Amino acid sequence: KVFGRCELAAAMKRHGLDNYRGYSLGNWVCAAKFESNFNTQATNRNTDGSTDYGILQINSRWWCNDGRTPGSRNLCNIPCSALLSSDITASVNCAKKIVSDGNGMNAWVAWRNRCKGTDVQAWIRGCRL
Template identity: 35%
Template sequence: MTKVLLIYLVSCLLAISQAAIMRRCDMAKLLYKEELHGFEGYALSDWLCLAFVESKFNTSKISDNADGSFDYGIFQINSHYWCNDYLSHSENLCHVDCIGLTGIEWKLHCSGRPLSYWMTGCHLA
């Protein structure tokens, strides 16, 4: 199972099983447990920043889009097949790889900023 699919599944499971706003350190522990620290060169603080920007750690957040699709969960995964994930049938309407789109909010709100405070007080072990 690839990490992209894992991220999607974690997001979906969080939305189904907890349906709540997660605490920052609990989210850090979960991401650490799922071995996302260092994935694609991103630290846990990057993932935490992204989750906060997208959903404020709200696992049950659902956002509707003008095109009729919806964004679900803590990472706001889009329901419409608008990129190619190489795992399922995709219309790939934007002619891009899905992994290339995952950093848009991160670039706007997290990239180049000190992010160590996202891990402050979190004990992962």
């Protein structure tokens, strides 16, 4: 599914992500836009042979099993495929872990380089939140 800017904002909120660990809702919609273009079916292979999965592009080297990344710790205890379904529940749940765990949202190269320090509130303008 390809979420609407506002529709996703709404959903991430409902899922308790607004201010989770101190990141405004906007920080999340932003990361997701540039990470996956609000498309949950998105995947991308990295050089190291891991693959990125979902709306938030969670990695298989650490967070989830897709059964063809070897070093693989599956800290999320989810098969990667799960992260691609139209309910974002599993992705949030896992994204929460990723972000708690030390580097905050820096863990998302995209967020860091294109989101960090821009007025991210602009992503949730218009929204009935």
